[PDB]
């Protein structure tokens, strides 16, 4: 049976665009019904890496389960959660993606972070995350203290380092900065490692799934 996304794109649904919340739960589907120009997708502007592949890999799913890979209440004792954005508004108020967590400085420091997750389930886990690129050095420091930060994401079949690039992009949804989105499929028995000293849009909800 087809998966109805309504007014949302695959990106808006998978990342958790706040306006894509009433979407009804489904554990299985074949074919995703998406409008030609969905209104609700990447509310916070940025590049969604390997998107078309993701769209293809999610076209037919036999099992789908969302879980809190990194629970908000206990995973980030040393960091604060940003107030999100007006670009991602819900009910007249600023919000953010439901499946991601915008970590910010706690006090006068954005401490180094190392968070890992082992795929205890017997299914593949879709992990998504982002990397923020402020438009100005003032915003970089205001949020992360350090001017030069890094983000590292490593598994047994994935390893990438992300360096924020501070600059004004053309305005999109009133935002000159950007959040680049990334993803990987964590096979059973593998471990993913998140390391950063700033600019990480951390995973909050991941998806254990069986493709096809």
């Amino acid at each position: 049976a087809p998966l109805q996304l309504g007014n949302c794109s695959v990106a808006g649904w998978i990342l958790g665009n706040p306006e894509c919340e009433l979407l009804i739960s489904r554990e299985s589907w074949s074919y995703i019904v998406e409008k030609p120009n969905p209104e609700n997708g990447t509310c916070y502007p940025g590049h969604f890496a390997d998107y078309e592949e993701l769209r293809e890999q999610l076209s037919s799913v036999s099992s789908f389960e969302r879980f809190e890979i990194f629970p908000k209440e206990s995973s980030w004792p040393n960091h604060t959660q940003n107030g999100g954005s007006n670009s991602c508004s819900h009910n007249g108020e600023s919000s953010f993606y439901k499946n991601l967590l915008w970590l910010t400085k706690s006090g006068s420091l954005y401490p180094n972070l190392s968070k890992s997750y082992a795929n205890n389930k017997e299914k593949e886990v879709l992990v998504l995350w982002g990397v923020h690129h402020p438009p100005t050095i003032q915003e970089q420091t205001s949020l992360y203290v350090k001017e030069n930060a890094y983000v590292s994401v490593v598994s047994s079949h994935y390893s990438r380092k992300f360096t924020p690039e501070i600059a004004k992009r053309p305005k999109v949804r009133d935002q000159e900065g950007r959040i680049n989105y990334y993803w990987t499929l964590l096979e059973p028995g593998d471990t993913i490692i998140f390391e950063a000293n700033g600019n990480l849009i951390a995973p909050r909800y991941a998806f254990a799934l069986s493709r096809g």
Partner: antibody
Amino acid sequence: QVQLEESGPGLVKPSETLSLTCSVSGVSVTSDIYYWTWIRQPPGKGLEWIGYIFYNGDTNYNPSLKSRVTMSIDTSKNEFSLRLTSVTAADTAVYFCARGTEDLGYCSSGSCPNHWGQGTLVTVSS
Amino acid sequence: DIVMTQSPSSLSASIGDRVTITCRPSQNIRSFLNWFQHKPGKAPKLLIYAASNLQSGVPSRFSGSGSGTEFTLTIRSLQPEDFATYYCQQSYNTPPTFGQGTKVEIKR
């Protein structure tokens, strides 16, 4: 914030090589996020894209002019340049230099110049 | 190779009028379309980015709409300083290509 200024207007003899430079102020031309571009407008015609250059070595020129175009970056002077060989009257135009910010979710690579210079007129004559 | 066709090529309207300019590419470009404004002797200015995003400092009377093969630039309340030539530009395929331009004149 950023300012771009093309080199002075003037003449180029036919079959010779046009050389233009763009002086950049406010940002470094070595920056990885920014691309540097040239565009032209012949008299009474519209706009024609010539190409872009990244400090990282990434370049792309319009197939209409690829063989004749060479672009470069000068980090010492914070400038970039355009060279066009074998010029003809068809190359008589106002040349604009410009900057763009790489933004792959909303633009092809190096394809959205959003800060332009005012342009310099090049006349091909003997 | 992607041909950008603008309509009309020139128009004249009174102060306060609503002005619409159409741009049609030769193929579907999704939302990879930008609108430029070019005044005599001045640097061309990016007004609308990716079909609909207003740029910093541009008055809110300018707006962009459309996707695929039909795009529209709207000036809701034409002002004298809006005299210029307006270009659409596609960013979907290389080489980037511009429309032939639309000259907007002021009726007074």
